[PDB]
Design a protein around this ligand. Structure first.
Ligand code: SAM
Ligand code: SAM
Lengths: 204, 206
């Protein structure tokens, strides 16, 4: 509610208004990379610090957790990060085709039961939404430790016709140049459970 | 001594497979689907599958005659009549089968050839994928198990690049509910290691 209003510079209260004008909000034409399901915001803050020449937008359905995320963006003074308290279905209300250059998905809600397939952020509907905002010059960068979700996601990507250009089935034992760990990633890393990673892009 | 053993057991190990191209149903005495395995090895998998699925006809191919001898003996030891073995490489598959004659291709713990210059020796590289298409047409599938993370990672990208559809994927087969999974010789060793077994099913887009 009212700590968001106070930090309305980082947390945009009316994101529909900047559809086709996100460059003005950032004051440059640096590529815009979004994250769907930011959570506490460790990943978006690290990536912001690491890549000053990319503009980051985090979207999170819960205000309770997006609050922790604005604090992390306020704490590291990264000026290249904004946060939206919106649902993934409103993405098309907020972005014109080609305005987004890349979509990050990090440890998304698995919804493992068949009947809840359409809640999964890798389901074809959400894939179409990412296409609408990237056109076909986009990519999706996905990591999770959930075996069921990754295996579902691989099938989903394949079914939609996306091209798999990167896949790790044990990310921590793969050569990552500057992979920023998410909150979830740091917990599961200790476990020895493998972290799954895919890059998919639209076929030219 | 391998050549002579194969000669005495020519009923199971077909010495001239090109001669049966388009007529494999006559060799089996039925129109049951023919599933093939490229890289049979010692033949545990194909013997188990034969015995489990008497309504499927199985053909194993193995380049090494050293190991295909062990495979003949396992096929002889289990009196499965729905299995033949060919001592041929994967390139020769088109000389042996007409399009659609093969319904399914099994790949089991194939040589990983990890270095970039050896990509073309990998049984999931686009050239071999083209060969499987030639013998299955576009109503086939490829059933693939391996313990090698590098090879599975590469294979997923290869399948995707060729335009195949991924319809099943397990990243931990032994902790997945698989009904009638037949372990290969290599698979049984790795099952006891906590090492995960990777499985994909991939089919042609229609
Ligand atoms: C399990 S948490 C992972 C958080 C963070 N990415 C990490 O890896 O540490 C997944 C997040 O996705 C968010 N989420 C799920 N569906 C969403 C949607 N449609 N729109 C926005 N956020 C969503 C959830 O609220 C939750 O915060
Ligand atoms: C890892 S070894 C044995 C694996 C065995 N199938 C298993 O899973 O237990 C794979 C086998 O495939 C054979 N092979 C390799 N390329 C082949 C080809 N083009 N045609 C037939 N067999 C081949 C190798 O010689 C080797 O015996």
């Amino acid at each position: 509610d009212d700590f968001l209003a106070e930090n309305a510079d980082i947390a945009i209260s009316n994101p529909a208004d900047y559809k086709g004008k996100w460059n003005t909000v950032f004051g440059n034409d640096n590529p815009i990379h979004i994250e769907v399901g930011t959570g506490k915001g460790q990943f978006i803050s690290g990536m912001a610090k690491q890549n000053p020449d990319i503009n980051y937008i985090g979207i999170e359905l819960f205000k309770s957790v997006i609050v922790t995320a604005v604090q992390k963006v306020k704490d590291s003074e990264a000026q290249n990060v904004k946060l939206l308290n919106i649902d993934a279905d409103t993405l098309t209300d907020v972005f014109e085709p080609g305005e987004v250059k890349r979509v990050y998905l990090n440890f998304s809600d698995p919804w493992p039961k068949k009947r809840h397939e359409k809640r999964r952020l890798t389901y074809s509907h959400f894939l179409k939404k990412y296409e609408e905002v990237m056109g076909k010059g986009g990519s999706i960068h996905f990591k999770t430790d959930n075996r069921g979700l990754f295996e579902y996601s691989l099938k989903s990507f394949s079914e939609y016709g996306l091209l798999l250009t990167y896949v790790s089935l044990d990310l921590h034992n793969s050569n990552l140049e500057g992979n920023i760990m998410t909150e979830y990633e740091e917990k599961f890393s200790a476990l020895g459970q493998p972290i799954y990673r895919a890059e998919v892009e639209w076929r030219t």
